[PDB]
């Protein structure tokens, strides 16, 4: 079967309310970049998106060996101008790949007084 690495980005918490702005999460794995839709920049933003990468059984073994990360980058989007500003990052571990979702703190968070976090699960699926 064709294998899928699937990252489910669920909701956020402890984010400042920015009424003119949206949030986008981008994720990159072995050079392939995916993104969520923009969602409202509330305190608990609702991403509710699955990002999935096709991978061979064999390539997956190499990546587990070298501990290849999945890099997530969180952006505040201005829908009037299309301006994106990086707000912070999250790094996911392939070894984590159903398992319960975990809450990940945004690293290098530009919202210095908020411990913003986004709940994420990662799994290996078929098809």
Cβ atoms of residues 30 and 63 within 8 Å: yes
Q: Which domain holds residue 127?
A: 1-127
Angstrom distance (rounded) from CA 120 to CA 103: 6
Number of domains in the chain: 1
Which of 121, 36, 19 lies closest to 79 in space, CA to CA? 19
According to the entry, how was the structure determined?
X-ray
| 20 contacts: CB under 8 Å, gap ≥ 6 | 78, 79, 80
Query: How far is it, in rounded angstroms, from Cα 122 to Cα 32?
Result: 16
- Report the b/e string of 76-108 with b at 16+ CB within 10 A: bbeeeeeeeeebbbbebebeebeeeeeebebee
CATH number, position 76: 2.60.40.150
Burial class from Cβ neighbours inside 10 Å (0-12, 13-18, 19+) for residue 37 reads exposed
**Considering only CA atoms, which of 107, 91, 101 is closest in space to residue 9?**
101
* Distance from C-alpha of 37 to C-alpha of 24, rounded to nearest angstrom: 6
Q: What's the gap between Cα 106 and its chain centre?
A: 10
Resolution (A): 1.8
115 vs 108: CA distance, rounded Å: 11
């Amino acid at each position: 079967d064709q294998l899928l690495i699937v990252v489910s980005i669920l909701e956020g918490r402890h984010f400042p309310k920015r009424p003119k702005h949206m949030l986008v999460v981008e994720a990159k794995f072995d050079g392939e970049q995916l993104a969520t839709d923009p969602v409202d920049h509330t305190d608990q933003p609702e991403f509710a998106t699955e990002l999935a990468w096709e991978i061979d059984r064999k390539a997956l073994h190499q990546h587990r060996l070298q501990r290849t990360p999945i890099a997530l980058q969180c952006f505040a989007l201005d829908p009037v101008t299309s301006a994106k500003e990086t707000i912070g990052y999250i790094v996911l571990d392939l070894r984590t790949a159903k398992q319960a979702p975990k809450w990940y703190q945004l690293l290098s968070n530009k919202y210095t007084k908020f411990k913003s976090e986004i709940q994420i699960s990662i799994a290996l699926e078929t098809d």
